[PDB]
Amino acid sequence: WNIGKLIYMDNISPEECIRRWRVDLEKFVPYFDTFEKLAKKWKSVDAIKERFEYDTWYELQKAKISKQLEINNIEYQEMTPEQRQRIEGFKAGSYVRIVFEKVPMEFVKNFNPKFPIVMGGLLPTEIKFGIVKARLRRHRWHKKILKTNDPLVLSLGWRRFQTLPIYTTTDSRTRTRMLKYTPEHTYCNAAFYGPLCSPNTPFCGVQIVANSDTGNGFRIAATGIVEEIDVNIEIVKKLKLVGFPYKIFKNTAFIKDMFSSAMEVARFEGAQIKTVSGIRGEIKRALSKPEGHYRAAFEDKILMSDIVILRSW
Amino acid sequence: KRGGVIDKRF
Amino acid sequence: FEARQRIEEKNKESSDYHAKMAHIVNTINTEEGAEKNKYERERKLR
Amino acid sequence: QRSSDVNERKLHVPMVDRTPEDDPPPFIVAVVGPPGTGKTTLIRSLVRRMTKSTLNDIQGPITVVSGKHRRLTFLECPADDLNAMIDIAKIADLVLLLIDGNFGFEMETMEFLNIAQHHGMPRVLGVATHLDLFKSQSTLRASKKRLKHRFWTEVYQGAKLFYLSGVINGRYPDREILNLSRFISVMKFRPLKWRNEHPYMLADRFTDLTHPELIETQGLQIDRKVAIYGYLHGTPLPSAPGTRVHIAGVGDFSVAQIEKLPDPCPTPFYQQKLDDKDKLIY
Amino acid sequence: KYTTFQGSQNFRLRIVLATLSGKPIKIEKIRSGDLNPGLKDYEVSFLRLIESVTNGSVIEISYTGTTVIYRPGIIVGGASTHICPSSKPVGYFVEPMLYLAPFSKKKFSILFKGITASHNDAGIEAIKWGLMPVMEKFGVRECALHTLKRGSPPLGGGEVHLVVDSLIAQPITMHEIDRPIISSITGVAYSTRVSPSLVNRMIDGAKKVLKNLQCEVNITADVWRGENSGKSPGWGITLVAQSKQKGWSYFAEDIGDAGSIPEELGEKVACQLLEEISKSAAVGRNQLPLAIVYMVIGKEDIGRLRINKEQIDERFIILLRDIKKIFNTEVFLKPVDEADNEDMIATIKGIGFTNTSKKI
Amino acid sequence: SSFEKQQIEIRKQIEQLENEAVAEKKWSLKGEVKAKDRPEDALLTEELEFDRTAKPVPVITSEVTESLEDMIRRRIQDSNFDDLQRR
Amino acid sequence: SPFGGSSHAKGIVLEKLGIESKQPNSAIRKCVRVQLIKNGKKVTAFVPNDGCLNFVDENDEVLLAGFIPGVRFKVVKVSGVSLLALWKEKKEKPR
Amino acid sequence: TLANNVESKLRDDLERLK
Amino acid sequence: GKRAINYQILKNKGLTPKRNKDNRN
């Protein structure tokens, strides 16, 4: 009664299995015999007294890989050919028949032998869909820069698809800020939704694939590496609120059009502000009359023509 | 944070 | 409340950011620098 | 101190090659070039030199035994399709890059390389054609030098570039073809980060296994059961059905069933372990 | 759709194996015939812990709740605190986290609170020198469990911090076809809210059993007292047989109840450790589930492990069957060429798992 | 056919995106904005993240009070008074 | 000799240590942890600039040459192509 | 009427703040 | 139909600083 077969004969219960060839893992401690019996068993300890140069680094790694590869062949050799195929599967070089179901009828009808049919296996990560945020640059030979939220056909792994990427910067490693276009001649952080992939997986982007719209221009639009995988992103955009001064008293001044109601001011009481000239200031309090007007103090006197800005995201 | 323990217990 | 939670949050990131850079900056100086003084003294010995 | 430098240039990133120790699959050779550059006539010329037989028409992958222990599969890339260009670059172990010498470089010749440059080097060989169109030897040799030094730009300096003058009876110069054939044999291939960690194969033949009765009682709109045959590459494919796999330009279909068939074009080197004969085509 | 399982059997592992795969799972018929059917509080707390360390996972427990549907997300880890029901000690939840921490986007820094010891779960000392040494062998260079507070039952009050700084693509392939030689035996004797004499009495009980062996025997006396001693009086022992040649360890542990003699307990665990050594070939039974799973998620290559016939038991069989249901991987076994013992060599092909969740 | 169906949903999605791509941007995404451009009091609804220049004035909560009085009792317990003395 | 007689050194790029640095074009942003292939000793090397740092990524081959004291080494070739050539967009790095 | 509209708007603001 | 490569492709001059004409001779 070899247990190699019995282990995978699910019809036989595990308790039935053990006895023939002779409870729960949630209990970490394994089962032990009764205490007094163990003591008598272990009055004598004799039963277990028995238990107690390569020239370069590079070839050592090569040696380790080869030595590991040699191990697989040795065991694969002795394994029965059926047992091998069960474990290793079909090895490369094997001529195999693959049967598929639920294929579109168009593939059968619109079949041209000239166009190749390539089949590529997928690891678990390729099945997952989520946000792929990556380092991307406009290709040097491409005429125009890419735009955010602009469709782009991307070549990832075995799969090609069209997606709407968003191009971002780290802003001195402080936040993920959205860009309108690619940098002219450098990489930028690019976020898009699609099938996930392992890091270190490179890709290309193309904006047009049809022959009709090919034109005379070079087509490979963008190049990059998947640097990140996640299923959210927190891309943010700078939103600047603009108000105007109408009454200025040395450092103190009153501003209008920044907000619509005093309630809006109240939420932003305590908020930092500055002018176009760069004079930093502060929202002190909301003026009762008229609505939306608030008092602000600046490090120096501002002028009527000065425009005050509140930086937000 | 995404994903939640949608608990249908009464 | 939000103002308090923010400002206290920002300080730790700034403090940790300084602390990490100081450590990695200095450890490179100590360890690599010792090898530099080691290499040059063999060069002087030659 | 040259020895230290020579001892240095041999060191590289330690990789693992998953190529089987026994019975490796035929290498995929991609014949890529602009339309009309001579892709079809090139394939016909090589296959004749390898197996001494001429194929009037070529469609889909063509597998031959090019050596005692080496086998090749020749694929013609549709020059007018960019999508076809991309996926072949993901699997083409070797590329025969066709360039019209009289015209010079063309965009797709660059773009195929560029797609290759981002998806991992296969071996790439430059083949220059229509050189007979040149009328003067001076302009010919100058064009060759300019063409060659550029091919050293995209591909490592000193990369081989083969030259073909004209086509006779639908065949290139036999002596030149023989030189290319030997070159295809001496090339030693490389481990690639994408190829060695996913299982892939190129379909040599296509078959629909759907019952004709089903096609009629439900209609042609019904989904179809399809069988695909060919040689596996890269990592071994797990035997159990249900594996998740992708077909380019079609979608992701889970294997319903799989089985290993005898090699239609077995290598002689395997057989003698168990010559004009030894060269086979399937 | 969903690979379906039955009962509360192997609840933590099936959830864990689902997470490593990314394959969604359904577990149904949990305690259907029980007066209190469905999930118990600690395992409900466990599912929350799984959610804390992952992103995008979907965990549905049915209205009757004898069925739980789990769609795993990506392992992210991060800094978090877990408040834990008294029904289980710390070992219950920290142990499965050991399967997930090295393959995470952000380092696992989980502060843990509750009872710290029990009769059926891994103790702190068991985790410290019984299991991290195993993952150290698998390549997890940095893994630590800091004991900030010890909490004995029934009131607990303990506190332990799990930190796994090492993030790795996958465990290294295992090659251990020999029986490690035990070079020395160590351990920690600990107590809470009681006199140091009790700790000294336990080590006496352990020492008298083991003096027959010609090892060095050094058991630490880690008496816990004061504010950090928790809320209840309790005491325990853990004895570890250590092999410095290849860094292998076998360990046994138990906690003392009210009315029990410290000498008797120290004596009991000594016999238990000797029992475990006799039953072990390369790792103890309590360490086998950690090793096999790590082996299975290794690179696409065969590793080798030596297993004793005493170790292939009911738990091992169901463990393997669960692995195949998720991973489709089969553990193949070979008799050892020696005749002195009847040991067994388990050979497993890794599924080529990689930590795609670690950022480069 | 099923494939031709999914094209229709894609053909539905593509038209929506084209309309959004050409539609006027929302006030939030318009960069510089003024009160008149946006809806009135929209900023109450929207959660916006803004810097604060100065410290928040502390609130004397109970757990603050107990901490201070514990300090006061300790000095009186130790008789540590930082007080002027005749010289 | 720093390289034991060689003029250049091949290395394995392990980690871009200064990647988190807030200040752009900082000296620390330009350092990368590289392990020498000939011996396995871990070493730090400079990158010419932050823009060039985009090109170097983990587990690619790099060629080192003599040059935050202690860093003696500058990357001159990555993946078989000169960094300056990539910086000048005269080339592409092969993968 | 206008006062009622102001009160309803401000109630909406209160609810949104929560 | 045939789309010859442009000058930027032809020389691969890339990004270079502007240089004075006098340097040419």
How far is C-alpha D267 from the chain's CA centre? 18
- Chain D nearest C-alpha distance from E168 (Å): 18
- Shortest CB distance from A141 goes to which of I3, I9, I15? I9
The SS3 of residue H10 is: helix
* Residues pairing with D162 in the sheet: D127
CATH, residue E191: 3.30.360.20
10 Å Cβ neighbour count for E154?
A: 10
3-class SS of residue A309: strand
Is A touching E (3+ C-beta pairs, cut-off 8 A)?
yes
Smallest CA–CA separation between F62 and chain A, in Å? 25
Q: Mind telling me how many Å the CA of I3 is from chain A's nearest CA?
A: 6
> In angstroms, what separates the C-alpha of E347 from chain A's closest C-alpha?
9
Total tally of structural domains belonging to chain E: 2
Q: What are the residues of chain A with a beta carbon less than 8 Å away from any beta carbon of chain I?
A: 140-141, 185, 216, 218
Pair (E245, E300) in one structural domain: no
Rounded CA-CA distance F79/E96 in Å is: 55
Residue D21: both structure tokens together: 């120790």
Give chain B positions within 8 Å (CB) of E54: 3
Q: Which residues contact D279 (CB under 8 A, 6 or more apart)?
A: D50, D51, D52, D64, D65
End-to-end CA distance of chain C: 68
For residue E26, the SS3 value is strand
**Beta-carbon count within 10 A of E195 CB:** 11
Q: What is the CA radius of gyration of chain G?
A: 13
Pairing of strands G61-66, E234-243: unpaired
User: Is the same domain home to E11 and E41?
Assistant: yes
User: CB D110 to CB I5 under 8 A?
Assistant: yes
Answer yes or no: is D262 a known binding residue: no
**C3 CB near a chain F CB, below 8 Å?**
yes
Q: Which of residues 218-277 of D touch I (CB under 8 A)?
A: none
Rounded Cα distance, A290 and A284, in Å: 16
Helix (H) or strand (E) holding E271: helix E262-279
Distance between CA atoms of H18 and H13, rounded to whole angstroms? 9
Does any domain span residue E328? yes
Domain-embedded: residue E17 = yes
What is residue E178's three-state secondary structure? coil
Residue at a domain's end among E231, E254, E274: E274
Using a CB-CB distance cutoff of 8 angstroms, which residues of chain I are in contact with residue G90? 12, 14
Nearest Cα of chain F lies from the Cα of A249 at a distance, in angstroms, of: 21
E360 belongs to a structural domain: no
d(CA D103, CA E341): 78
E14 and E61 fall within a common domain: yes
Interface of A with G in 120-179 (CB under 8 A): 135, 137, 140, 172-174
The alpha-carbon gap from F65 to the nearest alpha carbon of chain A, in Å, equals 26
Subunit contact B8:E62, Cβ cutoff 8 A? yes
For residue D30, what are the contacts with CB-CB under 8 A and spacing of at least 6? D75, D77, D88, D89, D92, D94, D95, D96, D122
Residue in C21, C29, C39 nearest the CB of G69? C29
Interface contacts A/F by beta carbons within 8 Å: 76
Among the partner residues D5, D8, D120, nearest to G95 by beta-carbon distance: D120
| Chain G residue with Cα closest to I10 | G90
Q: Same domain for E131 and E23?
A: yes
| DSSP secondary structure of chain D | -HHHHHHHHT----------SSSPPPEEEEEE-STTSSHHHHHHHHHHHHHS---S---S-EEEE-SSS-EEEEEE--TT-HHHHHHHHHH-SEEEEEEETTTB-BHHHHHHHHHHHHH---EEEEEEE-GGG---HHHHHHHHHHHHHHHHHHS-TT--EEE----BTTB--HHHHHHHHHHHHH------TTGGGSEEEE-SEEEE---HHHHHHT-TTS-EEEEEEEEEEESPBPSSS--EEEETTTEEEEEEEEEEE--SS--HHHHHH--TTT--B-
- Which neighbouring-strand residues pair with F23? none
G90 CB within 8 Å of a chain I CB? yes
Identify the three-state secondary structure at position E224: strand
Q: Which residues are paired to A294 by β-bridges?
A: A255, A286
Q: Give the domain-ending residue among E274, E293, E308.
A: E274
| Cβ within 8 Å of residue D32, ≥6 positions away | D39, D77, D79, D85, D88, D92, D95, D96, D97, D98, D109, D112
Q: Does C22 touch chain G (CB under 8 A)?
A: no
Residues E139 and E95 in one domain: yes
Q: Do D240 and E352 touch (CB under 8 A)?
A: no
- Whether A264 and F53 lie within 8 Å, measured CB to CB: no
Residue of A nearest to G91 (CA): A140
Number of H helices, E strands in chain I: 1, 0
Query: Is D241 annotated as belonging to a binding site?
Result: no
Which pairing describes strands E108-114 and A220-226: parallel, antiparallel, or unpaired? unpaired
Burial E72-86 (b: 16+ CB within 10 A, else e): bbbbbbbeeebebee
Write out the H or E segment, with its range, that includes residue A60: helix A57-78
Task: Give which of C1, C4, C5 to mutate to test F binding, by max F Cβ within 10 Å.
Answer: C4
Residue F34 backbone class (left: φ over 0; alpha: ψ -120 to 50; beta: rest):
beta
Task: Let me know whether E182 and E124 are in one domain.
Answer: no
Regarding whether E117 and E10 lie in a shared domain, the answer is yes
Q: Is the Cβ of D2 closer than 8 Å to some Cβ of chain G?
A: no
* Strand pairing class (E25-28; E3-6): parallel
For residue E38, the enclosing domain spans 1-177+275-355
Residue D187, both tokens: 């090339």
Flag whether E187 is in a domain: yes
- Per CB-CB distance under 8 Å, the chain D contacts of A200 are 193
**Closest by Cα among E268, E209, E210, E265 to E235:** E265
Angle, helix E11-21 to helix E90-100, in steps of 10 degrees: 20
Alpha carbon of residue E98 to chain centroid: 8
Answer whether A92's CB lies under 8 Å from D25's CB.
Answer: yes
Where among E250, E274, E298 does a domain terminate? E274
**Cβ contacts of F54 on chain A, cutoff 8 Å:** 270, 282
| Angstroms from I13 CA to nearest CA on chain A | 11
In Å, how far are A18, A236, E85 from I4, measured between CA atoms? 76, 43, 74
Residues 6+ away with beta carbon under 8 Å from E233: E152, E191, E192, E193, E194
- E288 in the same domain as E152: yes
First to last CA, chain E: 33
Within 232-261 of A, beta carbons closer than 8 Å to E belong to 232
Residues E143 and E230 in one domain: no
- Tell me the residue ranges of DSSP E strands in E227-343: 234-243, 248-255, 302-307, 332-335
Whole-angstrom distance, CA of residue G69 vs CA of residue G51: 22
d(CA D200, CA A93): 11
Query: Which residue is associated with the tokens 């083991």?
Result: E210
Pairing of strands B5-7, E58-61: parallel
Q: How many Å separate Cα D17 from the centre of its chain?
A: 19
Determination technique for this entry: cryo-EM
Consult the annotation and say whether D33 binds a ligand. Answer: yes
User: Alpha-carbon distance E218 to E189, whole Å?
Assistant: 11
Q: Is residue E231 part of a domain?
A: yes
CB contact under 8 A, A25 and E272: no
Instruction: Tell me whether residues A117 and D203 touch, CB distance under 8 A.
Output: yes
Q: Is A300 helix (H, G, I), strand (E, B) or coil?
A: coil
**Cβ contact (<8 Å) for E59 and B9?**
no
Is D139 marked as a binding-site residue? no
The reply to whether E10 and E143 lie within a common domain is yes
* Cα–Cα nearest to E186, from E254, E134, E237: E237
Amino acid (1-letter code) at residue C10: K
CB contact under 8 A, D235 and E352: yes
User: Binding residue per annotation — D39?
Assistant: yes
Q: Are residues E138 and E61 in the same domain?
A: yes
Q: What is the CATH number of the domain that holds E81?
A: 3.65.10.20
Q: What is the largest CA-CA distance in chain G?
A: 38
Residue E261 domain-assigned?
yes
Burial of G61 (0-12, 13-18, 19+ CB in 10 A): middle
- DSSP 8-state assignment for residue G88: T
Q: Which residues of E21-31 are buried (b: 16+ CB within 10 A; e: fewer)?
A: bbbebbbebbe
Angle at D241 between CA D235 and CA D244, to 5 degrees: 60
Question: Taking the CA atoms of chain A, what radius of gyration do you get in angstroms?
Answer: 35
Option in I2, I3, I12 nearest D153 (CB): I12
In a domain, E12, yes or no: yes
Task: Look at B3 and E65 and tell me if their CB atoms are within 8 Å.
Answer: no
Q: E243 and E150 in one domain?
A: no
Q: How far is E61 from chain B (nearest CA, A)?
A: 6
Spell out the SS3 assignment of A200-224: CCEEEEECCCCCCCCCCCCCEEEEE
Does residue E172 lie in a domain region?
A: yes
